[PDB]
Design a protein around this ligand. Sequence first.
Ligand SMILES: O=Cc1cc(Cc2ccccc2Cl)cc([N+](=O)[O-])c1O
Ligand SMILES: O=Cc1cc(Cc2ccccc2Cl)cc([N+](=O)[O-])c1O
Ligand SMILES: [Mn+2]
Length: 181
Amino acid sequence: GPLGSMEDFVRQCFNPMIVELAEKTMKEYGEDLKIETNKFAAICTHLEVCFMYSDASKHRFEIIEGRDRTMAWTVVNSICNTTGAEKPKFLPDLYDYKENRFIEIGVTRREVHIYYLEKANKIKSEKTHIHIFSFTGEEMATKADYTLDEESRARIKTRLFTIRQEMASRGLWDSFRQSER
Ligand SMILES: O=Cc1cc(Cc2ccccc2Cl)cc([N+](=O)[O-])c1O
Ligand SMILES: O=Cc1cc(Cc2ccccc2Cl)cc([N+](=O)[O-])c1O
Ligand SMILES: [Mn+2]
């Protein structure tokens, strides 16, 4: 069976903007995308999911994730002073102007409940809302509040399913599925 390059897949499957933001994220975290290709893919995936989440209800969400750290932190600070929200330890992904809370998105090849627990413990914030997607359609949100309607989340799930099927047809899926730390 023919086995493809993950880097190739990423550059063909993801938006050049997304790929660039992922590239810069890997830059500023001291890791080589040419070696950690699965990670390149995961960061691209997370980015696309955050963007789709925001795009699901335009002008409701503030995007924190896409920006470079310094800009993202200025944006977070601004949101905090303007709204009165608790400043997070971590860069969250979104801000919900409707529900008045920061949102952390997660995308996992693992079991979503465990991943949710690890994410929650990793952020140490009782005010931040957590939403976890898997590639298999399963999801897990804070206090069973899934924020978006079934259709939007189905759009996201369909995208994830497609990414997985295209990974698998290139033989890339197994290494990716099992390389999650
Ligand atoms: O699993 C959580 C997770 C969080 C992040 C973001 C992150 C990285 C360091 C500290 C907190 C947070 Cl939220 C990044 C990655 N990653 O590149 O695989 C993660 O796997
Ligand atoms: O898996 C990649 C990944 C990337 C990000 C983006 C990111 C956010 C903050 C710091 C580092 C990075 Cl790579 C976030 C999460 N996350 O919150 O679970 C991720 O799982
Ligand atoms: Mn983040």
